[PDB]
Structure 1
Amino acid sequence: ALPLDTTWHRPGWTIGELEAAKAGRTISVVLPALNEEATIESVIDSISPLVDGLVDELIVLDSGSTDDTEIRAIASGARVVSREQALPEVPVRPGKGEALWRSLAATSGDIVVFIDSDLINPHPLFVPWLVGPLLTGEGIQLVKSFYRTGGGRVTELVARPLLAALRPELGCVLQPLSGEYAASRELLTSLPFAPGYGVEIGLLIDTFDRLGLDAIAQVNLGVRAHRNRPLDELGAMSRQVIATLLSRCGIPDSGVGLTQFLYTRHTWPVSLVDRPPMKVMR
């Protein structure tokens, strides 16, 4: 009942049916990871059985981990790609947005699926459930998940109310910041990639501004648990989500970083520099 293809229930397709509908299209899965040694294995394990079938490629984009993320992920059979390796001609910047952007150059799938590597016990139907609308539907180029400490505080207090205020047509997207989603390569390599934690909200809005809702679907993945960061780390994330949201809506951002008083004072980085469409690097 939303102006937006929303699969509220457990999708009916089977792996064999979904695989049939590929029709020569390839599927790449990317797990971005920064210091996720405790959950990375269970996430890979939940997806690796699809490889050489529904999924043609799985990588861990290691965003500079200093723990045992890489050795654990290799031991799980995964190809692990550093940011450097993904695109060596261009120096590495920090943040998640950098990692997803770069992952576009280390993959070749007509469809790209992103799964966060800190999920606690991810269901192995996550990927099949996300490529569903891209395969069977028409016009769909972006599929966002929804679900459910916690509650998605930055989602419920910042991104959703801000979308209500500045892009109300996106008010029917239930989890605009979700790290689990899939999209066509043609769309992904045509859009710029916001830095740090701005990347999701930036892709959602440029996708909308460029193609309208009809290109966007969302799908219930059920329940979703992950690391629940402390409030001060979220402030920093929220600051970046805000900077990216305002820019896509034509509003000048001060570029000034959030300062916190814990009393002691800390100033977190924010970035106004988007990475350009990966096309320009061909």
Structure 2
Amino acid sequence: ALPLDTTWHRPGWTIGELEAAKAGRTISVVLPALNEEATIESVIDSISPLVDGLVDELIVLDSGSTDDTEIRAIASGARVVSREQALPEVPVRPGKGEALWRSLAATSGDIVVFIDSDLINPHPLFVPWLVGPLLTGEGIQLVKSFYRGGRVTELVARPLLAALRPELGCVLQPLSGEYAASRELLTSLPFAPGYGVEIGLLIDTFDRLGLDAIAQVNLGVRAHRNRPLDELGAMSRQVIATLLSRCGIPDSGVGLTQFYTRHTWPVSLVDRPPMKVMR
């Protein structure tokens, strides 16, 4: 009923069937983490039984955590890669997008899966449900997830998409941190800084390959640490900055100011280049 390949109910494929359809292709799973000690262990544990089987590689991309994120991740048997270790030749910039970009240099899988580490009790079939359309179907190179309340999603991302890219209006969770894509697509696209990375990869994939290369899959219900409104303001600002860039609209580059005292949050207009150029 939608111009977008959409799996509404729990996918039929089994872990056995999916591993067969791989056909020589490898699968890397990346968990981006910045101070996520309370939830990181549950996330890793839900994925690690797939290692050496369906999943060939599982790493945690530590974005400079100061809490017990690393030591707990190690204690769960996961390989922990810092931003520095992922790409030592290049100095580190702040932001989520930076970590996700660098993670491409720390993995070698033909298919890369991204899962947020702030998930509260994630289902162990998340990764299989994501690589589904990539392994079975053809033409698909990007699989987004949807669930369930996403204030930035429902008030900023989706209304802005409706205004400037109405073709992507059928995407339920454009800012979803849970998605999978081929290395071919990811290393060919630029990576938006900060929280712009999700909405940036979506629009850029659409512009390059059209809706036919994009699929979305239901993962049920999601629970995560709900953030204070001020953090969401900065997050929203970066989403707007990235989205405007992809639509040929000049952004002021001026960070969002909040007041009763004044503080200004950083915003970045600088994308990282496609990972291919770092060959």
Q: Do the structures match in fold with TM over 0.5? A: yes
Please give the secondary structure, in 2, of the residue aligned with 1:238: helix
Gaps of 5+ in 1: none
User: Residue 78 of structure 2 aligns with which residue?
Assistant: 78
Deviations 1:149-185 (A, max 9, x none): xx00000000000000000000000000000000000
* Aligned counterparts of 1:35 and 1:232: Cα–Cα separation in 2: 18
* Aligned counterparts of 2:174 and 2:18: Cα–Cα separation in 1: 25
* Aligned counterparts of 2:37 and 2:171: Cα–Cα separation in 1: 31
Please give the secondary structure, in 2, of the residue aligned with 1:145: strand
Matched residues, percent identical? 100
Query: Displacement of 1:106 after TM fit?
Result: 0.1
User: Residue 57 of structure 2 aligns with which residue?
Assistant: 57
* Aligned counterparts of 1:14 and 1:85: Cα–Cα separation in 2: 35
Deviations 1:170-227 (A, max 9, x none): 0000000000000000000000000000000000000000000000000000001101
* Aligned counterparts of 1:16 and 1:265: Cα–Cα separation in 2: 56
Please give the secondary structure, in 2, of the residue aligned with 1:240: helix
* Aligned counterparts of 2:125 and 2:224: Cα–Cα separation in 1: 17
Gaps of 5+ in 2: none
* Aligned counterparts of 1:224 and 1:30: Cα–Cα separation in 2: 19
* Aligned counterparts of 1:25 and 1:177: Cα–Cα separation in 2: 27
Query: Displacement of 1:78 after TM fit?
Result: 0.3
Please give the secondary structure, in 1, of the residue aligned with 2:195: helix
Deviations 1:108-165 (A, max 9, x none): 00000000001000000000000000000000000000001xx000000000000000
Please give the secondary structure, in 1, of the residue aligned with 2:80: strand
Please give the secondary structure, in 2, of the residue aligned with 1:143: strand
User: Residue 134 of structure 1 aligns with which residue?
Assistant: 134
How many aligned positions are there? 279
* Aligned counterparts of 2:221 and 2:52: Cα–Cα separation in 1: 27
* Aligned counterparts of 2:161 and 2:118: Cα–Cα separation in 1: 26
Query: Displacement of 1:246 after TM fit?
Result: 0.1
* Aligned counterparts of 1:132 and 1:51: Cα–Cα separation in 2: 17
Deviations 1:87-109 (A, max 9, x none): 00000000000000000000000
* Aligned counterparts of 2:25 and 2:201: Cα–Cα separation in 1: 22
Please give the secondary structure, in 1, of the residue aligned with 2:240: helix
Output the TM-score relative to the length of structure 2.
1.00
Please give the secondary structure, in 2, of the residue aligned with 1:187: helix
* Aligned counterparts of 1:227 and 1:181: Cα–Cα separation in 2: 19
Please give the secondary structure, in 2, of the residue aligned with 1:144: strand
Deviations 1:52-97 (A, max 9, x none): 0000000000000000000000000000000000000000000000
Please give the secondary structure, in 1, of the residue aligned with 2:250: coil
Query: Displacement of 1:38 after TM fit?
Result: 0.6
Q: CA RMSD in A?
A: 0.3
